[PDB]
Structure formats: C-alpha cells, structure tokens
C-alpha cells in the first residue's frame, strides 16, 4: 500500500500536459514504474577463464581487403546528454575547446569525413543528447552541411526526481532508442552493428582490425588494464559475462577488491553492440541492467534518489559475449582542465581528427599533470597559458595559486610552482624549467 | 716533439723514486712505469656497426632452462668479486661508502657477506669474497673486519694502484686511483689470482658493492659452469633496460666481429645526439660482469687487455686544473675471444648513490631475506616511486635525525621535501606528497600523520 | 524623605498611566494574561524603588549525597515517582552558541537534541518501572511556537508532554524611566506555573514534588536517592524545599552561596555583595558552596505561599544595549532566592557529575568526545580514563558557531588523554586526529593550520 | 706673515729626521721625492668671471678626420710613445692589486688589451711603438711579475714609478701614511727617470697620456695626421681631447679661455654662489676626457724652468683606524695653462668608455659591443644609437660576486634600462628589453630561469 500512493500522483501528472506532448508521455512514466518495482525487491564463486580474452593477437588475422566492405554495414553513436559545469563552461561537454581550433563535436566529423572519402562508404553518426544539450547542439548543426556525413539527433526519456523524506535516467537508457524509431530505420537498410564510444573519450576511434572478429558474435566490451590512477571502475558468474559495479560490493569484500590482482578488469564504455539481438530483448523486456543510488544533495535543498542504469549492465541479458584488451591507445577520456593542457600539447599529433600519442616522447608513459584550484575554470585555464608549453620530455608538473605562463615555455622533468596565498608568480617567456620548484 | 716533452716527464719522477722508503720500492716502480705505459697511449689516441641480435640475450630464456641440480653444484668454481675502493663524502661521510649503515642496521658490506653465508651454510660449501680497495678505503676497512670472523666466508683484499696527479696548464706532476680497470693488473700482481685457479676455481664474478641487488645467480651461473652446446664463456656483461632515471652510460655494440664499449665521450660530435634513442640503443652498462679465471692469467701476460683511455678533468678544490688518466672494466670485452652480455631485470641493479635512494630502499617497499632484500609486495603497479629530498636532507647523519622512523611508502607515487622539515613514528605518504618549508620557517609532521596527495606548505 | 518621596511617588504614577495606556494598544479581543502582566509589572518596580553582614551557614542545613546516597534506595513499588514532575527551563536561545532557534533543538551527540536526550530518559524510566512520570516544559515566545511544531515527533513515545509560557514584559529605559512601545527569566515560574492551571491539576492527580532544572545541563537527572529523601523522610520533618549544591572550582567562583540569614538560609549573589567585602566571598573557600539551579520543590508548598503573596525574591537591574540603541534596564528574578520563604529548607551537596551545562561550543566538544559514553539518554564520564580530573578546553572566536565547529572537525577527536587544549584563529583537524597532554595550536593572523588525518599531537605547540 | 715660515721651516727639519733612516742605496729618489714635497707646501701656503672659451681654439674631429689620412707611410707612428696611467689599484672593484689585471673578455686583462692593440698597430704598419707604464708603489712589483708574459709579442714595454709624498695632518699641520700624488706627478717623475731624454734622443716628438680604465683610447691616425705634419705651419705641443656632456658626466673639468691661454676648471675651485652655472648652463658642452697629445720636446723645457703650472688639489681622508689628514695632489690637464698654442679638440664618445664599476663590466662584456684585435667597439644592429643605462646593486659590486650571479652574460642589444638590487641571480641565455626592474627585499632571492626574455617588465 506504499507504492500505490506514488502512481497515483503519476496519473496526476498525465493531465497536466500540453496537448499535444501525449505519444511520450504515458511512456516515460510506465518505465519509472518497471524500476520502482525493482527498487523495493532489490558471489564469490567463479573466476573469469582464460577462454575468454589480447589485440596484438587480432591484429594477425587480421585486417581484410580492402574495400571496403563491411565498413558499410555499420553505425556510428557517440554519447551527448551531459553538461561541463564541472569543467566551467555553461553547456553540453561537446562544445569545448581541444585543439586549435576544433571542439570535441568538430574532432568526431573530422574522423568520419577521412574514412567517407577513401573508402567511398557513407556511415552515418548520431548523438543520443539530454534536453539541456538539444537546444544548442540543435542550433549549431548547420554548420555541419556540405560535409560528408550523415546525421541523426534524438533524445532521452524524462524522469522525476524522488525525496528522501516521502533528471536523466543515467546513460543506460538506450530504452529511447526503440522509442524514436530509428532502432527499425536502421536494421532494415544493410547495417548489422552500433559502436558506443562516449564523446569525453577522444581515442575511441572505429577499429579496422576489431571490424574483423565482428562482420562476416554479436556483443564486445572493450578493457584496459588497471592503473593506480583510476582505482575503482567496473569489472564470468553463472556461464555469462556479468558487469560488477563499485557499489554492489558486500560490506566485508572492499580490501579483495581492487587488490591484488585478483582483476585486471577496467570498463572502456567503448562497446560494440549487434543490432537484430535488440530487437530480441527491447520488446520481449528481458534487458537485465542494475540500478543505482546516486542520492546527492545540490544546492540547498533535500537529499534526492536520481535512479539511473548502466550500458555495460546488459551483458548478463545478452547470449555468446566475449571480451578482447585494448592497449591505452585508444582510451583517453578527457575530464578536467589538466587533462586539456596534456591533450593540446605537443605530446600528441594531430592527423585528420584523429589524435594519438606522438613522437619522439621516449617513454610510452603519460606525465600527468596536476593543476591547482584557480585552472578549474576553462575561461580561466587559457587566460593563464595561452601558448601550451612544451612538454615532449616533461615526467610531472603541479602547480597551485595565482601563476601565470608567458609564451614558448619548456618544461622539463620535475616541475613544481607553487605561488603562497596572495602571491601571484610570472614564468617569463622563453623560459626553460627542468627538475625545478618556483615558490 | 712530442717525445722530446714525454721524456721530461719521464725523468721527472726519477727524483721522486729516490724519494722511496726502502721496502716500499718495487709496488712503486710498477706503478709508476704503468702511468707511463698511459701516458704514451694518451698523446696518439666507425660507424656502420648495428647490434646483434643473437650474442645478447633475454634472461627470461636462461632462468627456465635452468636450475641446476643438486649437489652442489659445482658453485666452487667461482669467486665473488666486490669494488671497493670508493670513499662516501657526497653521502656526506668522512671513510669508505661500505661502512654507511643500509638497514637495522647491516652496513653495504655487512650486508653482502650475509648471502655468501646462506649460501654456503645451505649448500655445504666454501665461497670466497674478495674486495678491491684502493688506498683511501684500504687501511679503514681492514681494522673492521676482525667481526667476521667465524662467519662461513673466507675474506680477501688487496690494493688498487696509485697514480700522479698531472696538470692541465702544466703538464707535470706535483694522487689518484686509476679508477676500476686497474682490476686486471692489480689482481694479478698480488698474487691472488694465482692462488684461486690454483684451487680450481675458474671463474670471477665483479660487481659494485653500491648495486644492492648485484646477487649471485645460480641459473646465469648454469649456463657458465657446463655451458650450452657450444664454446665460450671469456666474459659475460649483464645489462638492463635504458630508463629516463639514467640517461648517460654505456651501450654495447658490436664493431668488426667482436663487441665493443661505448662511452659518451668516445663519441665525436656530429653523432652525440644519436646516441641514446632513436631507441636502436635500450641497452645499459649495469657493471656486473663474470669473467674466466683461465682466460685472465693469458691475456695478461702479454699486455693483450686493451682499454679506452679516461680523461678526467677537476680542478676542485682550490689549485689548478687536474688530468686522471684511467680505464674501465667494461672497455675490455673486445680483448677477450668470443663475447656475450645477457639481459637483466632491473631487481637485479639498485644502486645506492643518494641519501634519497636510502629512503626508498630502507622502506617498507623493499623486504629483507637475511643479506639480500627484494621488491616485496604488497605493491599493486610494479612502478619504482619518485623521491627527491632537498639539501637540508644530503649527509646521513641529518638524514637520519630527521626521520624518527621510516614512514610507509607502499602506496606511495611521488614525494618531494625541501626546507627545514622534520617527520614523525608511523607516517604514512600515499600518492603525490609535496612538503616545502621556506628560509625561515620549519614544518614537523606530527606522528602517525598520513599525507595523501597533498601540498604542506 | 520631604522631598524624596514626592519624586519617587510620582515615578510611580507616570509610568502606571502610560502602562494603563499600552493596555489598550493591544485593544485584542485576546487578553489572556495582559492585564496580569502589567501587575506583575508595577509590583517589581514598586520595589525597584521603596527598596549583610550576618552569619555563615550552619553544619547541618546543608548535606552530604553520600551520607543521603546510603540509605538507600527506596523500596516500593516505585511507584514513589508517581508524586514527582519534571520541569525543564525552556526560556532561552541559542543566539550566542548562533543557531537561529531555541537551544532545546541544537544537536549534541548521533545527533540528539538537548530535548530528545531528556525525553529518552523519562522514557527509560517508565519503561522498566511500569510507571508514567510526567514531563513539563516551561517556555517563552521565543521558544514555544517554535518546539510545539516539534514534539509531535515525541509521539507513540511513553511520555506526556507538556506546555506554558512565562509572561511577557516590556523593557523600561535607563535614562528616562519609560516603557518603549522580554521575558522576566526563570524566577517568574510560581506565579506562571499556577496561573498556567497546572499547579492545581497535578496537586488534584496525586503529585506532590517538582523537580526544576535547567534543559543546558545534560547531567540534571532524577535521582532516587535524594527522591527517598523528601518522599517518606526520615522522623517525618518534613521539607519543602531542597536545593542541589556544589563544591566551587577555580571554574566558578562568580556564583551564588548558601548562608544563614538572622535565622534562615538566603541565596547570596554576585550582586548584591557591598563593595567593601566582595573579595571574601571569591575567597577563601571556605564558602565551597555553589548553586547548581537543580531544585526540588513541594506543591503543596507553593499554593500557600503562592495565594498568599510571600514568595520573596531579590530583584536584578541587568542593564543592555542593543542595538542602534541607548540603555535600558530590565526587570528579572531567580528561583533560588526563594528559599528565604519557605520552612525547613535544606541544600544537599552534590557530586558534579550532575552538573554539566553545555553553553559553548568548547563545551559541547568534550560531551561528544570520546570521554562520556552515552546510554538511554543520559551521559556519565567513562572509565576508561584513568585520573579523575577535567580537562580545560578553549576554543577560539573561529570556533564559536555550531555551523563552523562541525565543519573545522572532520571528525570528533580522540581524547582521554587531554589536560589541556587551546586553540586560536583558522585552524582545522582531520579524520581520526588523537589528542593527549596539552596540546596549543595558535595561528596568526592570514595564516592556516590543517592537522593531517591520523595526527597524534601530545604536549605540542604547533603554530 | 713671520709664523709661515715658521711652520714651514719646522716642517724642513723635521723631514730632516727621516732621510737619516733611509735604507743605505733609497735616497738619491727619497730625498727629490722629499724636496718635491718642500715646493707643493711652499705654493699651498702663499696660495674670474671674464672666462668663455673662444671658437678656433677647439676643433670637431669631423673636420679633422676629413682631411684626412697620413700617406707616408704611416710610419708618421715611429714619433710617437703610448704612455698608458697605471697607479691604481681596484679594491673598490673588490679586487687584491692593480686594476690594470682585472679580466674584462675571455678573459683579458686590461693590459692585455692594450699590447694586443700597439701589436697589431706595428704589425700590420711594420714599425715598432714603445708601450710606458706610469705606476706607482701600489701597483708596481705587482704587474712587473706578470710583465714577463708579454715576451714574444711586438711591444716593447717599460715602466717608471710616480713618487711617493708625506700625508700631512689636518690640525697638526706636520707630516706623519705615505701616497701617489695624483696623475699630475707625471712631468716631474718621467724626468727624472730618464726616459724623457732617451726617447727625444730616439727623434720621437710626441706622447699619447691616457688611462687604463678607458678602453676607448685607442690610438687615432687623424690626430697623428695633425700633430706630426700640422697643416698651415703652426705648431703646439699640448692637445686635450674633450667630449659631450652627458645627465651621466656634469661634474666635470672644462677649458675656458682665462687671461689669453686656455685653462682647465674643476667643479672645486669654483665660489660658491656660481657653482649653479658651471655643470650646465650648457654653454659648457665640453668636458674632459683626459686623453692627452703632448710634445716631449715641450716638456723637458718647461720642466727645467720650472714652469708647469698645476693647482694644488687638497684632498681630505681618514680611513680607517687613522686621523684627519690632507693628502696635496696635481692634474695632467691643469697644465695647459703653462704650454705653448695649446687646442683641444671634442671628440666622439666613442673614444671615452672607462670602466669604473661592476655595471660597466657587464656593459662592456655583452653583445653589444663587440671585439676584435685588442680594441672593442660598439656595433649593429645596436640600432638607436644611444648607451643604455646600468644600475647593479650593493650585491653585484664585488667581481667575484659579479661573475657567481651572471651564469652566462645575457643579450643587451636591445636593452634601454635595467635595474636590479637585492639576492639575485642569472640563468643562461637571458634576453634583456627595454626597461627591466628586478628588485628583490631584504630576506628574499629572485632566480631568473634559464631562456627567459624579460622584455619591459618589474619582477619584484
């Protein structure tokens, strides 16, 4: 008798709609329900086989000739439905600046234009955007025509927030996807496949050699070795591959995780998804993906449940998957602005929209950079550069406080600058850095 | 002209050898005539050499052909040779770099001898040390070994040759030790080689007393004692990985059917950029090296070992610019037949030249199995971790005052400390640390404090 | 006296008119108590203008809780908390700890309010004695609409809570002697209690003993032993009124005293102390003798007393000025200063593990330390910590708001081992910080201290 | 009157006692050295405004230079002797000895430069110019030493000490604590040491006085041109080169035409109620450069008259541990006066770069100037012509101190104004533009990194 006092005031909610809004409407709220369901019914025991998952082994199949042919029979999402609050900047984590002078939307035409344009195929993109980035991405797509590609926007179900007391559903929800009908638009023409690669992660090219294992199975998830750098993240149960989240974990196993190894397991969010399965799960409703928490309270109100699910959740729900390593080429998601001064710098080339690590960087090892409070801010980020360094030999930098960096700079080794509090320090032009500590 | 201000110098030193205390006589002239046999060399003094890819070759394919059974084995063909000639004053210590205490504390020597000892006290046999010191590390060494007595391990020493201080400007003499290829001559001429292949021990093993992780290694020594189908060994040179650590040493080519030493001073200027990647060159002198006993006694005789001349130059401290003329070990592969080096695990070269290194490796990062200490996890990446103390931080004694215990470092990426700081019991760094004190001010790190990834200014 | 008792006489009369002018200003249909309150009023200003030393107090008007302690416990059913009411004094803000509300709703330990650690005491005494003691909260306009929106919280509980306000006054100036167009304190209580028809309604249950303290101190519990006392005492005097003391620390020297007084006991405060003498009652101790404000009183008693007019009490001057304002007075009174009207009073001497009250945030710090330990409600030191001693902590102005305090303790320190702390300007402490010996942490002006998480600071001074 | 020759008759006597304990062979030079005293005391004890120097009696070096250059041969060098001012140590540079020894490029010496000059003036001309060294008993023993490095270079090099006088004392007016009086002491002691007569009996006619510090003092044909060969007939003896005054060099000595000759003035000789007017209103342009061109004929005889006519400069000292003394001196310039048809000519700066100070060295050795055979030389693209303006601080005064905090002598062409003070120090390959502040408080260190390009910028 407490769950039927909710969907009362979900068909309450009904008659409160604007005419015409009614075809997504009734639907949007009848999937809240089949998880509401789920929220008040809420191992180890088996261990990933070696008869499971290398590339360099693919690689020497390997790659068929030549044209094309095959790169025909496939579709190309990348996802959208998120702002860069975070990074600063009002508006869709698309529409950022990267390298001179392209933003993350301009690096993913760029990469289709050079594949459309020797190989003489026409693979389509689509944005899977929230509606708080439809309105602009919308209105910028112009400038987009008279380029060779197509393009195909659609959005994602609206959900009501929870109180504690008495919002996107997460970017597992492609749900929509039956819902805008371009799941039956684009099975009945030739394609058979759908590459998920997320928008932040600028390494999550199409591959030519994984291309191989998939035309002429069905479901891959993509892995990378874990690194002291990103801890938690998620990682055989039962005869299928089953997706095993942060927060699922019991209360007694958290030390059995992430140490030793134990896992090499990472999530890429880079997947390969077969388009005719779909259809065979969507409408029968046997897609089995875990929902989450994710209570967080902003910005001066009650603490509220956003109930979301998982891509990589439907493997469980999926038959005959197996997965294959990735090396760190082609994972390199982007997230604050520290991770912009790495990208736009001479550490990577740039060749036709697509960027990857670049020569003669010796070591094969990524510097990370620490940058202070007062980078956060993008608009604030290139206020204090403008002119990325040059850092083809540099091992770690951090920086803290009011510091500013004139044109052409070296730096080399070591560096830390760290400026006291109403301290502001100037880095002359030209200057050369190595092994050093500016206070 | 040349000769005519070579005998000048060579008469020079004619009033100095008067100049002789009676029974220290003939180790003077030896010596002496030695730097002449140099000095010649020095007035006088490629490319299309590739290295090959079947003299040098992985580890990974010798420790798993590979152990060598039973009893045992013969071991007692070899001998374990340790440099020891090197004093300790830029780890601030007045005396030898041996005696700097490392661990509990077991000191560099102390700690070597204590592998010898399991080894022998494990294997029912006799393994000797040897250690070559020079003059500056010869008389303080000595009166502390009397503590190794009644340890299964016969010890053994003798003196590296001394040479004349000459002048850059001057050109004349007014003393030094001809650094470590001195070993060949000085070996012999004591006499101690003579007496090891006289027990029918037939190959050396040299290393640093400084690489902490110089071990002796049973599956390399397989593959010596009762060799593969085939000939050799004359001489045999481990070597690891190029790391951005370590960016000057050697690399070993292979110049005109024998392999050569490379020095980055041989190297004439149009080519000192090539040198050191394009990655053609992942191949580093680790300086732990076996020889043949049987092989040295030959080529010695008939001055058949043919080095590259050192030329170093120093003025320090106060007075005019100085010229050491010297040789290397590893500059004397390509006087001995058929040469092969093998590839080695960077556990097996862990130099201590730093107070900083001390730190690392006298952590809970490294656990020690009586002697000799090894990478103990847990340790999730396999990632040696950065660690650069300050000035405040270089002489021992001040290192060792300002840490009242040696944190926990197990999780630990970076750190890096400058100014006057001073840390606590139970410290826990993890991930990124950065301490800086500025002229004037003092930070202590309160006990049992855990800084992860943080700045303390 | 020719001339003085003119001016005075017609103080009295120019005020009284433009008070009989502020009746009816007012002109509410709701008057329920004005008119009262206004005769309460010129009753203390009456003698705010009409208006020692003697001996000390005798050896056997005040006692020992051993002695009492030890007698002991009473035996039946009991069953003899069936004649007691609590009283709670809920007159008061939290403006100067700063939290916009009655102090009864701060938070003090996983987190329960002032208010909820003493209903889960009364509860945790009718629970395990089948009994239903009655708890009252005597509150202001400041404090009840506020909490009564509340203690429907306190629901399904076993307890029955109750309510009243103590009157309003309007606050007279200094200069000018005139009314500007507060409440009186804790000593208003008899005549609010009564007028409030409450007085009559237990008296008429079966109820002949209230237990008065204050809602700031944690450690003023019901306490069977001193209950013994009064219910079947011992030769059948026969009292009354019990007053609760203690032994003075260097803590607190500026309270008040028990003395007799040409026959009978009188509360001696700062006060009223000439100029002449007021460093022999600081000293020599010698007066040990302190008040804790914890009262038991009979209400047969207060009725007699209360209908008859005799309750007398001294009266306070209390000047303040806030805001954008000159000075005013404001006419208050306190309930100890009572004993002087009633018959065989008596003060018991207490440990001070009953006397705690938390009015700074260096206060609250200890009590949700690791130093007490908290069970049904009520909090007592904990073995173990070995050597009996309190510990002296000062915090800083930095640490003065609640909201900052939670905020600077990521967690609440390890202590035990404190002997003192003193902490100054912008400091802040991590998860899992111990803290033993004395420990001064002092930063200056434009400088921070963040004492790293797992920090065992003993007999330091860090800066 | 009578009380003078008291006090200077006592003072006679009382020299007197101090000839008898002069080392056996001392004394033949003591004693004139001691009698040259005897006639300084004797003038100080018996001690305008019509003064505007007229326009033919001093020359633009344009008009000169035009002229212009000697044919035969030139081998007009054969009568002439550098006589180069030696004198004078370099303690306040922060420099032990003589200051003739400091390195300046690579580092040479300041007399290395010189006889890398005269060198490849007789190498290239084939004729043999004579170096003279004027020391004094300060820096004498300590450059004859290092005079045996020059063997084998084209240079014959002599010397000769100026004489040494008592330090008399403010009250007491008696003399002690021994001194070199001044340049001026050049007509009395080159005399005596014979060398006058020698080289006037070698034919040469002419000297060229001029100072170590200024390594702008190279030898000029054109002047030769006018000197040796001077066109009309006319015939003098004493020439003054004279320059521009700059903001930088006021307080100067200029010529002005006193009762019928030329005559130097110096800033305290002047009353004090005109000192205003002298050091600017310019009017007075020129300024000394105390590079001079003088007759050796000349000399020898006016010295035998007696009749070099300098004033007496009074010089008060006490330092460190001593008492106030007066220290009496004399100019080279203040002798014009007392020569025949003396001229003065002004000259471009270019001739007049003396290195007194830490700021100079830095100046000297940049890129903006640049070297070659011994002189050095201001050149392109330094391209606004003017000399950019260096004030190091208390800290860079030493030149040890100096050379410590310059890790590499940093880029100068384009600098117009650079300040600095306090705990700095210089990366490599600095780049300095227009005005550069860098001042650093007391208690703080400025380290500029390596390849930095300070360009019009305060790094505080």
Redesign the interface.
Known sequence: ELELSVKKELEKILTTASSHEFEHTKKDLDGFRKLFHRFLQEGKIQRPPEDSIPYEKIKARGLPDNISSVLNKLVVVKLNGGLGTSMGCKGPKSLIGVRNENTFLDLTVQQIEHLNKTYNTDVPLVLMNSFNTDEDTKKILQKYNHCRVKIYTFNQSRYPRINKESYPPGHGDIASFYNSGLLDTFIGEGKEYIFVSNIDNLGATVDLYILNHLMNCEFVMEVTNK??ADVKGGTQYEGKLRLVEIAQVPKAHVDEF???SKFKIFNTNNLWISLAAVKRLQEQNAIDMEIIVNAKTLDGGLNVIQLETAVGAAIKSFENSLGINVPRSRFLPVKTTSDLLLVMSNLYSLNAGSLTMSE?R??PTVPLV?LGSSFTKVQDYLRRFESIPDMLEL??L?V?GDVTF?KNV?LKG?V?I?A??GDRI????????EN??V?
């Open positions: 690194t002291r992430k140490s030793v003669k010796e070591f620490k091992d770690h951090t803290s004139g070296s070591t830390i760290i006291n509090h100037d880095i002359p032009p030209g200057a050369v850095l050093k500590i206070s």
